[PDB]
């Protein structure tokens, strides 16, 4: 440790003054800032991660909605499945396909989905 510069000094090269929404990257060697709007163009970028979990199920789509309602607040039914929060739930035979976002909250309620279909 202790291999940094001034703790209030950083190196930023994008998009400078004017208001900017940015990100800070600090390594064991260097502290640097990029502007978020500019950042998508760099080797570093905002990434949406879709993670799909296929869950064995013995009940019907109507029953899934019912079980989801038991735990959930916001359950919305859609033409091609169910959507809880930002989680896409679709029943496919005797398995449910769970696809959900990178986002912290989206995993948590999605976890609740998984237990609903599980047992």
């Amino acid at each position: 440790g202790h291999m940094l510069a001034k703790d209030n000094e950083a190196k930023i090269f994008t998009g400078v003054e004017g208001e900017f929404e940015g990100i800070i990257i600090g390594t064991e060697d260097d502290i640097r800032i990029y502007k978020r709007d500019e950042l998508i163009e760099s080797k570093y970028k905002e990434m949406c991660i879709y993670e799909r979990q296929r869950i064995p199920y013995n009940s019907t789509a109507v029953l899934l909605k019912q079980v989801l309602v038991d735990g959930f607040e916001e359950l919305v039914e859609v033409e091609s499945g169910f959507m809880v929060g930002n989680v896409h739930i679709v029943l496919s035979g005797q398995e449910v396909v769970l696809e959900w976002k990178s986002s912290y909250t989206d995993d948590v309620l999605a976890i609740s989905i998984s237990k609903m279909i599980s047992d």
Binding site: A10, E19, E28
Partner: peptide, 20 residues
Amino acid sequence: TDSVASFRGVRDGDMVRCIG
């Protein structure tokens, strides 16, 4: 090995300040 964080800020002069 890097540390990352997101912020909303206003840039004025040599000063970087968070507004959000």
